[PDB]
Amino acid sequence: EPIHVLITGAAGQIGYALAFRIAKGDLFGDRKVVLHLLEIPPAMKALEGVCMELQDCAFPTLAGVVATDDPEEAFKDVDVAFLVGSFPRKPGMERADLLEKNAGIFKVQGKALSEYAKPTVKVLVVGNPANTNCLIAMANAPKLGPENFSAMTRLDHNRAIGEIAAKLGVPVDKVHNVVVWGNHSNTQVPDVSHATVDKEGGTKKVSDALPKEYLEGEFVQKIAQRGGAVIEARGASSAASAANAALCHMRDWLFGTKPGDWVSMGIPVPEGNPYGIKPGVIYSFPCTVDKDGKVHIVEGLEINDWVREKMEATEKELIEERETAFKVLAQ
Amino acid sequence: EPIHVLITGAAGQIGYALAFRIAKGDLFGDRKVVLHLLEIPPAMKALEGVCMELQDCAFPTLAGVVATDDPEEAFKDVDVAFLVGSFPRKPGMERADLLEKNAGIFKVQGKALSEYAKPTVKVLVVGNPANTNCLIAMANAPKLGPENFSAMTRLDHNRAIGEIAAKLGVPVDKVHNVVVWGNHSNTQVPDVSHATVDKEGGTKKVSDALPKEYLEGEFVQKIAQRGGAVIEARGASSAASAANAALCHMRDWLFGTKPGDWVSMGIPVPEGNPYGIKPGVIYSFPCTVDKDGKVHIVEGLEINDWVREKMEATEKELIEERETAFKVLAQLEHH
Ligand SMILES: NC(=O)C1=CN([C@@H]2O[C@H](COP(=O)(O)OP(=O)(O)OC[C@H]3O[C@@H](n4cnc5c(N)ncnc54)[C@H](O)[C@@H]3O)[C@@H](O)[C@H]2O)C=CC1
Ligand SMILES: NC(=O)C1=CN([C@@H]2O[C@H](COP(=O)(O)OP(=O)(O)OC[C@H]3O[C@@H](n4cnc5c(N)ncnc54)[C@H](O)[C@@H]3O)[C@@H](O)[C@H]2O)C=CC1
Predict the structure, then answer these.
(1) Taking CB atoms and an 8 Å cutoff, what residues of chain B touch A16?
(2) Domain B1-151 fold
(3) Which chain B residues in 161-220 lie under 8 Å from chain A, judged by CB atoms?
(4) B99, CA 20 to 30 Å: which among A81, A126, A181, B120?
């Protein structure tokens, strides 16, 4: 039977990019897909245009399209959900205002997931602020659990890979064990202190190839500021690269990661995590995923004082956003 | 060794869609690609942003990116060229109205291809009016030949398949031998008089499943107006579906068509084509492509009176567009 995949904000730049890749088989391969596309009413005219284009692609893997502005219809029997839709950042809008505006959206979508989606639904939150939006959706999804939710830091992760590969002058598939800790924000911790690069014989630690000043300074600022830089250049969002990251995240989450491969995923903090992060937020960790689709935090990593401090700062921000989010929802 | 692929208008809607698909391996598979991306100076800021996004995808198949506003740099030693760069129509006009704004581009790019690209370069013209822009480019490429050039009707073709599949109520891969003849314009001839459809109980002719009046009326107008319909709905270009069609066209052109499949391609009209079209324009024909990448017009097709009249009408339009284009170029040349 076909798999039911939801994309919210489907008429937007990320939704658009994601829809055609999923429709043509990039996510589930040969398995047929029924795309659920959710928009708000003012975007429905454009969304029907997207549906026309999908038909005009003649992709055999696309078994059906459900375009709607009704959450009950959008979330019904969904197996996979990309929560991309969110209020647009107008000129001059601050992060704090965006948090408040989106809080209500993810409360509604959390409830809709709980009541309408399959109990096994895998929910990836892309819309910003991703970690906190994910927290809100999960908080309002009583029929679901922590295993159903994650927030996307995979674009931060892919950015780190691309940049370190270029710095080292190696192809991207020769870089391993990169990590982005914490929040999808400027307090994210791009951490290559565990990363390795393939040489002729075996591997080489990235920290042995490059100086500390770069790895903990310039590199960090480069990745943390990359989203703003793309926006500045294009005068638009990082659509294709974000859609790509979302697919990579979901693919690894659904089918598992290869041995040795780490992927950064914002996940509910378990009390047993070995890095001292307190439960109660969505926090990006280095993860593996087994063939059952179960996420496992990578253990046994030595955290230096610099990484430790950065990890603490981003946790503190995540806690702040939560409290800010809970207060606005309380009304 | 990596293949060098040019996309012009790379910061724009179709160019952006096409770039990531090519970069990730959708066109050449596991073979490495170096992308050449050409824009005009005002769009270079955005193009560097696209280049950032490409790096941020971490695709192993992408061996390099050359982003520039210099045609000499952009066209240098290119193997494959998607000429997308061009003004789109908006919100609702004729593709021939773009002729004035776009004709000069293809004159320059034709010369650049001839002088800088590999003599074996495969050039797909997407920018509108596609058939006439392709003619202009070829006319200005003295080193190259008809084999180097085509114009995209593959989106018309894919629309026709999607729509007839939906109407027939079958999956899209169950429809075969669709044709779109002529100009990528309102006079295009979506022709399913040769098409077949596979069902549980066997293969049948589309003409036996649907009435002639639908096939020559409602269906035709739907496909002919589809480009404008999408533009009206989205308030933007048919970016992803056009990029998809461009990739389909180029893939089939480079690697050949699967046995039994026809694809519609705008190509230079050869002397002694089977269907009476006069040489001197770029005309969409039903084509197969062999493993050598050589295009062949499908022969022996029975052309009914309705299709014949439509084919003549679209040829007439292409000839008119050619003469308009040459007049426009002569005017521009002399201010
Ligand atoms: N986690 C990450 O790495 C990244 C996150 N983003 C975030 O993704 C989000 C979307 O970005 P774009 O696609 O560029 O924005 P966009 O503005 O182009 O599209 C957003 C779409 O969401 C729709 N929408 C608004 N409220 C909705 C609701 N309640 N339900 C369903 N749909 C709704 C809008 O109609 C719009 O079409 C933004 O919040 C952005 O900050 C963007 C890039 C990377
Ligand atoms: N054949 C077909 O089936 C289709 C054709 N089209 C056509 O494709 C063309 C592009 O459409 P969009 O990408 O939506 O337009 P767009 O406006 O989003 O992008 C066009 C890009 O071309 C660039 N450009 C202009 N002159 C140039 C030059 N001399 N060299 C390099 N780049 C140049 C612009 O800077 C711009 O970024 C249009 O002419 C449109 O009509 C669109 C859809 C389907």
Answers:
(1) 239-240
(2) Rossmann fold (3.40.50)
(3) 161-163, 165-166, 171-173
(4) B120
